Amino acid sequence: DPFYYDYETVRNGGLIFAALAFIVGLIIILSK
Amino acid sequence: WNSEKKEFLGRTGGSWFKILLFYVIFYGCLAGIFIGTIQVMLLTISEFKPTYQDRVAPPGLTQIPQSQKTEISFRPNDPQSYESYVVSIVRFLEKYKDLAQKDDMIFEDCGNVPSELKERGEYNNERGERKVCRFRLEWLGNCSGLNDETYGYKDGKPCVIIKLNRVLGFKPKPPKNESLETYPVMKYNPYVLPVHCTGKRDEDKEKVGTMEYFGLGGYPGFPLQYYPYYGKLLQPKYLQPLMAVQFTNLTMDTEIRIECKAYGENIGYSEKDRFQGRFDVKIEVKS
Amino acid sequence: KERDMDELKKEVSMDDHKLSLDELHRKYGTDLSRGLTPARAAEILARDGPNALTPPPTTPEWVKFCRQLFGGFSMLLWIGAILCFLAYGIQAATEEEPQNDNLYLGVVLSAVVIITGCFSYYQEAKSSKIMESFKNMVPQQALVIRNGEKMSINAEEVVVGDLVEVKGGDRIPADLRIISANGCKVDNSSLTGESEPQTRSPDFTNENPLETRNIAFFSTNCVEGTARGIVVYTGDRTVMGRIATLASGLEGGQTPIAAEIEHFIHIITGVAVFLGVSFFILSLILEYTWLEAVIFLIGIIVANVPEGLLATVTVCLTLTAKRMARKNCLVKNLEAVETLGSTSTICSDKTGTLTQNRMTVAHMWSDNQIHEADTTENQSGVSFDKTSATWLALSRIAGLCNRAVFQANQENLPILKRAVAGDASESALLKCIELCCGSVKEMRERYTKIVEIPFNSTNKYQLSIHKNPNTAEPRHLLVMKGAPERILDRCSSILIHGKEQPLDEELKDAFQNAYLELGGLGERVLGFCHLFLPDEQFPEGFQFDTDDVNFPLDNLCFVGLISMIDPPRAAVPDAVGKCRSAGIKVIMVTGDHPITAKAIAKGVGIISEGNETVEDIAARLNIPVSQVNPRDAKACVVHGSDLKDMTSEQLDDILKYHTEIVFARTSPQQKLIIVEGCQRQGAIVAVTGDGVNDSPASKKADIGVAMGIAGSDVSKQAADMILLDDNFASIVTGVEEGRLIFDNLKKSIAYTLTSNIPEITPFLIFIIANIPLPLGTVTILCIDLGTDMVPAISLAYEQAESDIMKRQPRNPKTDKLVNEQLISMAYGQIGMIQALGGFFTYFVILAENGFLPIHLLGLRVNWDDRWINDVEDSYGQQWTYEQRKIVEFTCHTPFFVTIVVVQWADLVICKTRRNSVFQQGMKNKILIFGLFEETALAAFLSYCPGMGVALRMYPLKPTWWFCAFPYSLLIFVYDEVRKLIIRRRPGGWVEKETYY
Ligand code: BEF
Ligand SMILES: [Mg+2]
Description:
Chain C: It holds the Pfam family Cation_ATPase. The complex is a heterotrimer of chains A (32), B (287) and C (996). Chain B folds into two domains: 40 residues; 230 residues, Immunoglobulin-like (Sandwich). Chain B is 13% helix and 17% strand. Chain B is built from two helices and twelve strands. Chain B is extended, with a radius of gyration of 27 Å. Chain C folds into four domains: 167 residues, Distorted Sandwich (Calcium-transporting ATPase, cytoplasmic transduction domain A); 255 residues, Calcium-transporting ATPase, transmembrane domain, CATH 1.20.1110; 184 residues, HAD superfamily/HAD-like (Rossmann fold); 206 residues, Calcium-transporting ATPase, cytoplasmic domain N (3-Layer(aba) Sandwich), CATH 3.40.1110. Chain C is 41% helix and 13% strand. In chain C, a hairpin with a 2-residue loop joins strand 1 and strand 2. Classes of the chains: A mainly alpha (32), B alpha+beta (287), C alpha/beta (996).
């Protein structure tokens, strides 16, 4: 059915993104 | 006091025409873009298909007198006490008269008994404007079932039509003959979609109501020969089924509550949305 | 009638110091050797007040916190929460969900008002609470004489007109009329800025009773000697008591930034009420009864608010206030932090401020040649050639001949900045010897002092004699110093490279011309001489005596002069070199004398070499000083004597027609009006000082600097800035920063103001095209105050796009912070495209789901209705309520992903005001971090579970993300082709309509 959307997938994926870019920012502000 | 300046309007009127002509050239470009963008995004909307519909998954059971808060409160005496609710039913069914439905080029006379689904090809435009199944005021006995016996509309005893939301394409599946507790309903589970109402939900209930259901050829639900829906553009002046429930033995000067659920695999219920899969009305026939 | 009181305090004080002592004793009724009776003393001590300043009138309450909570901006937010708690009391007529929505919005708006107003009231509070904080005192108990009997009583039981004796070490208990004295020198450095110690005498000497000698002053310690003096003024009637009180009852004035803040909050509320009205009008025009026609007026006046431009402002500053905390420039209040980069004229005191107030070896005379010592605090300069015999002679002379000796714990401290008990000169000398020529510990104990002769009354000399340790000549050694004219009278032999000579009149006038050439230079000069003794006439064991001359007072052997002066702080001069290169005017204000000031001003660069004064041009042409025209003198020395006889326009003419200005012998009161004459030009003024003489002048300067250690306790208590290390080069770093925070701020505002165009136009066209709600308020709350938080913080660590110190200081009336072209950009242009991409985000969603753009006109009506569960789209689908409302909130949330998207393009084109962004680059790390967090946050908020439930934001289908792309793109393109045509066409149109 076109009446069912893999909501749980892009979520678990938008939070990976929210995990990746933030620690790259934890990487950038700590230049040693 | 800077509004007026020696031969110059407000803020440097002298270069007035510059600033403005820039704000006329810029915004009209800002507009000639955005509209390019929107006109693009309208070229991608499929002409006959909505791209996303998942958010209408469990359709819902509505009423004709879309009251203020699902409460029909009126005096069987006062003509105006009920004019609201009734004019609503009058207008609601204004589009439904057999003579409004005359020309046969876009209309088609279907079985007078609940039939199988009327697949008319595919949802595309290859075919021409598809025909709409008709609907005659009869199938609703008493409550708006012809001129005879219903001048008032509920004036005496209350009654109300329940309706299924239109959902494009929905092939409603009724529960199988192995009915997972579907209360009193007759063995016409093959070609219909039933409903049944209750005073309260799942505990002790102020049970006060004798119900009588009017349907096509006399069943309690939704015929299968009208679905699925194919859309306005494909199907204009299409008429979806209506179904009526009437409350006869009702306490007048008391208010009770009524829940009307609809059953099947293709239907769901939501705790946060009481109008998804079921239906609710309070009533009070005060006099 | 206390304004008449505050006007008798800006006036230079007056007195009655010049009487016969019999007349003193007749007007006050007291004995000059017996004082008065403790009956008459317990009579006057309760007649006016204990000899005590009133405590600071300011001991303020805390309910003035309300003002921050209010203003003009926080009101709109108070009518915001009020009228969402109202809408919700209205939402009680049924069973409603705002158990997690509109109740929570009034408290959210209640909290910005309250958390915002806790932050600013703590910012301006530091000015009230911590800018009047300078305390650490030892109460000194006075030596009073009463009914004959010397009795020491506490400082406060003292009264007016009784006898007091002081000695060396005692603080002056109040303001006295010296009736008797003996060798008494006192230190009035703190009250008048007088450098070296001034002697004191009963005799009436000057008239300006300040520089007179028959009067002492409160808070001045008596340096040496002992004296007797009658009490004239007690408590707050003192001179210094008039000065703290004039320091405390003046206005700080407003810092160059908060004025914009208020005039900013004005424009936001006036376009908010402008909109709230003409649309309040149109919503009662259409249909909405008085009930949701007012709820919208909340929906908008409240949505127009940059809810978190206030935290982006507050950190935009903290980070400037931090970078300045890195450059040894501390601010009590965060908004004096920009004051310096905008200053045009700096006022500075000489003593304790520019200088260390410590007499030092400047120049020396040996082998008819002049050698400049090293005159810095940290020994970064030029040491003379120290190999010839003249110096080794001249050196042991000064080093043996002194009463000066080091103190116990002076070993690790710099040899200069360490404490010395002894005269100023005997300090300066002792110092430059222990410095240039090794240690004087084993050098003053090597020689045995037989008899010495301290400073005399007649002539000028100090001498001593010692044995010969040398193995060549066992002859006795004799040494002495004295003034250059009275020693030249008693001297003849000369010394060169180890061999003697006599006085020829040729070199006697090259000496009379290197004494008036080193002494017109402001330095103080002393002649050093020695003589062997005829060891045949005086044997190796004869202990001479002091009744008679025991050795030749003539035919002596002169060695060399040695010059000294109160020298400047090491970092001073370069620091001044900087302030001028930046075009700052620099003016010198000192209570010191016009010759030591003139020397000190010529040597620090306030007065460039070769500028001539009204007096230097008049003595060079041997003409009366009245002849010269005052236009040809670029500089000018203005005695404070003409400075009491002057008006506003004359001064106005001095400051206008003279570049290098120096004021001398100007009372503390006179330093204030100086700051007030430099402020009748409209320029900015930064006042930097040492003692209490700069209290009123640091008080009414736009920003006052104190000295951290050499600073007294009342001109520190007014200064709006502190130089703890007393490093004066710290001011050089401060002009650079107040001029950088200025420019990086202009970027921080323009970031959040552009947002306020794709925040409002939703709530706008909504009532217009009567479409469903495109942008919720929960959403405007996370743009102003949620995600942009950290982007608009990172934008103020931005750097200098060019050479900051190259351009001149800004012009307050012209160069504005928020000007009408910054506006023309953020609201006029950039935010418009921001609206156009978010709106385009809006139409793509509702159209792809079923509602064509052309069909949503006149829809919001049936749309915002909770009981129309059958609403037909352009595909004929019947939508319940929570279903179609679900599609709004997921048209609220993507409009918010689209904004962060454009707030990328806008965070990168605001990062540079003039330069292309491939020229300034992305070297900023925090800003990188700011894009990654402002995006990870936003992606966390949509897809986080139960986000639709608490906040009513749902997760995004992916195809949505990329609807702000060419919009964030085109935006980057526009402002970049703008920041290149203004790089190629400076001359008008392109640069003039836009540049903010
Ligand atoms: F302290 Be300054 F020399 F007036
Ligand atoms: Mg001073």
